[PDB]
Design a protein around this ligand. Structure first.
Ligand SMILES: Nc1ncnc2c1ncn2[C@@H]1O[C@H](COP(=O)(O)OP(=O)(O)O)[C@@H](O)[C@H]1O
Ligand SMILES: [Mg+2]
Lengths: 374, 270
C-alpha cells in the first residue's frame, strides 16, 4: 500500500510496483524504536532479506553484530573484511565467567545473575540449594582470581578471569565437607570443565571482537544436546551485547538469528535477557533484529510474558510464508486482518507483510544484482 | 480446631479500630484452659503473669541447606532494617553472611541441631567482616558497614549482638524500620519454637500485625502468610489482630490471603 520515508534504504517493492524506502533510525509517531522481528518458516527468505538489509545499513555506517547458527553470514563477513568468530573452535572460545560490563552497581553481582540463567540452561534440574551453593562457589572462585565486588571489568585481562575449570575444582574441594550441597553439583560441572563440553568454555576468551562487522558462528552446535545449544547461544548473546556497552558506537545492529534456540520453558530468563536487550539497545541508539522460525516457541506459557513483548514490540516487522501453527499464532498476536492472513497464506518466497510502526503492507523483497555477490 | 467441610484451618483475623485486645485475651485464656504471643503493646504481660507462665522482653542463628534458606529470611530481616539497600548491596550482604558463617565453622552441610547458641556468629562479626571487605570494596561495602555499625556496636546492638508473651513494646517510639525489623525477627524465632517442637494445637498471636507491613518489603508479610499455611500443616493456629495496609497494591498479593472477628471500624472490609 506504500511506505516511503524520505530517505534510508530500499527494502523492496509495493503491491503497485513502488519502492518501499525505510529509515529505521527515525524517531517520531509510531517509530519508537529501531528494532526488527523477522518471522517465517524455513526457506521463505529470512536470512537473505536480513543480509540485504544489513548490507545496506553497513554501507551507511552501521556496525553489525550477528549470532549465526546456520552459517549464513560467513561469506558476507569475508567480503566485508569483518571478524568471523568460530565459537566452537579454540580460536573462538568465549569464557562465560568473564564478567560483562553493566547509582553504583557491582559488575560482579550483575554477572552472577547472568550466570544463574547460564547455568540453569546448561544444568536444567538444579535445586535451590545448589543454585545458591553455585552462586557462592562463583564469588569464591572470583575472589581467588583477584576479582572482587568493586573490580572494573574494563581493566582486567582476558586471562585473569577464572573459568569453569576453577569453578568445578572448587566445587569438588567443597564436596568433601559438603557432599550433599555440592556433590552432585561438582560432578555435573566436570562435563564442562574437562569433559565432552569443555572445548566450549574451559579457558580464556580468545577474541577481542573489535570490528564494524562481527559474526559469532555457533553452527557446530546444530546437533549437540539442547542445553548446550541454549547455554552457548546465551553466553554468546551476552558477550555480544557487552560489545555495545564496551564502546557505545551508534546505529549498531545486533542480529540474533534462529532466536527460538534460546527459548527454554524452564529458564525463560534467557528470553527475558533478550527482551531487556531490545529495550536497552534503544538507549545506545542501536537496533536489535530477531530472526526466527518456530514462532509458537516464544508464545509458550512459561516464556510468553517475555517472548510476546520481544516479538511484538519492535517498530519494524517482516512476516513471510509461515508454518500452519505459527501463522495462527501470529494472526492472533499481531491482529492480522483476514486479507493479511491469506496474504501470508499464499505468500511466495521473499513476499509477505512488512510492518513499520502501525503501517502494514504487502511487500516483495528483491536485491540489486551488484549486491548478490554478498 | 475443627476440620473438614467449611472448616479448612484454625486461623483467626481480629480487625478493628474497639477492644480487640480484650476479646483476644479472653478467648486466649479460654483456648488455653484446654491445654505464644507477639505483643508490641504489653497487653498480655499482666495476664501472662496471672497465668504464671513465662514472660520475656540473635538473627544470625539458623537435600535442602538450613543455611541457604535462613539466608533468605535473613535477606528480609535486613531489607526491613536497611530500607535503601541496593541489589548490589543486598548481594554483598548475603555473601558476607555465608563467609561470616564459614569462619564460625558452619557450612552448607551442617546440622544446626549441633551448634550452641554461642557458636553461631552474630551481627558483630558480620559488621567486622564488612568493615574489612570495605577497605578494598568501598563501592560495594562502605555504606553497608557504616549502616551495620549501629546494629553491631551502636544504638541497636543490644537487640541482636549476642548469642540469643514476647514483649516488643520497648521499641514503640523507635524508628519504624527497627521495630518492623525486630518484629520480623521475633516472629521468626517464635515460628522456630513451633517448628522445632511439634506440640500440636498451638496458637501464635500476632498483635498489631500492620507493623510488619513494609510496602517496599512485602516479604515480611509473605512470611506471615507462609506461617499461616504451615501451622495448619502442624495442626495449629495463627491469630493476626490488627487496626488497608494489608490491601496495598504491593502487599495485597500477600495481605489478601493473610486477612482471609470484626469490631468497630472498614470500607475495604465491607
Ligand atoms: N528475495 C529473494 N530473491 C532471490 N533469492 C532469494 C530471496 N530470498 C531468499 N533467496 C534465496 O533462497 C534461499 C532461502 O532463503 P533464506 O533466507 O536462506 O531462507 P530462511 O527464510 O530459511 O532464512 C537462499 O539460498 C537465498 O539465497
Ligand atoms: Mg534463516
Amino acid at each position: 500500500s506504500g511506505i516511503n520515508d524520505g530517505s534510508g534504504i530500499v527494502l523492496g517493492k509495493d503491491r503497485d510496483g513502488g519502492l518501499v524506502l525505510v529509515d529505521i533510525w527515525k524517531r517520531g509517531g509510531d517509530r519508537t524504536n529501531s528494532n526488527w522481528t523477522i518471522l517465517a518458516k524455513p526457506g521463505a527468505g529470512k536470512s537473505f532479506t536480513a543480509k540485504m538489509l544489513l548490507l545496506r545499513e553497513y554501507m551507511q555506517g552501521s556496525r553489525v553484530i550477528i549470532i549465526d547458527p546456520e552459517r549464513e553470514y560467513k561469506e558476507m563477513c569475508r567480503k566485508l573484511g569483518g571478524v568471523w568468530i568460530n565459537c566452537t573452535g579454540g580460536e573462538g572460545k568465549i569464557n562465560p565467567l568473564q564478567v560483562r560490563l553493566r547509582v553504583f552497581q557491582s559488575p560482579l553481582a550483575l554477572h552472577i545473575q547472568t550466570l544463574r540463567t547460564f547455568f540453569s540452561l546448561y544444568l536444567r534440574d538444579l535445586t535451590d540449594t545448589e543454585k545458591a551453593a553455585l552462586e557462592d562457589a562463583l564469588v569464591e572462585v572470583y575472589k581467588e582470581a583477584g576479582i572482587t565486588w568493586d573490580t572494573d571489568p574494563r581493566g582486567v585481562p582476558n586471562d585473569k578471569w577464572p573459568t569453569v575449570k576453577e569453578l568445578y575444582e572448587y566445587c569438588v574441594k567443597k564436596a568433601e565437607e559438603n557432599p550433599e550441597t555440592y556433590g552432585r553439583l561438582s560432578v555435573l560441572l566436570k562435563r564442562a570443565a574437562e569433559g565432552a563440553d569443555s572445548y566450549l568454555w574451559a579457558g580464556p576468551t580468545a577474541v577481542e571482537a573489535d570490528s564494524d562487522f562481527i559474526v559469532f558462528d555457533v553452527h557446530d552446535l546444530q546437533n549437540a544436546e539442547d542445553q548446550v545449544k541454549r547455554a552457548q547461544y546465551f553466553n554468546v548473546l551476552s558477550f555480544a551485547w557487552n560489545i555495545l556497552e564496551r564502546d557505545r558506537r551508534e546505529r549498531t545492529v545486533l542480529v540474533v538469528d534462529e532466536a527460538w534456540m534460546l527459548v527454554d520453558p524452564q529458564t525463560p530468563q534467557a528470553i527475558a535477557f533478550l527482551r531487556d536487550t531490545s529495550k536497552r539497545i534503544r538507549k545506545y541508539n542501536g537496533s536489535l533484529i530477531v530472526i526466527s522460525q518456530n514462532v509458537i516457541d516464544f508464545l509458550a506459557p512459561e516464556v510468553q510474558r517475555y517472548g510476546q513483548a520481544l516479538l511484538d514490540n519492535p517498530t519494524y516487522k517482516l512476516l513471510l510464508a509461515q508454518g500452519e501453527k505459527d501463522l495462527e499464532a501470529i494472526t492472533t498476536l499481531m491482529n492480522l486482518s483476514e486479507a493479511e492472513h491469506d496474504l501470508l497464506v499464499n505468500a511466495k518466497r521473499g513476499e509477505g507483510l512488512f510492518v513499520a510502526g502501525t503501517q502494514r503492507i504487502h511487500i516483495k523483497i528483491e536485491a540489486a544484482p551488484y549486491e548478490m555477490q554478498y
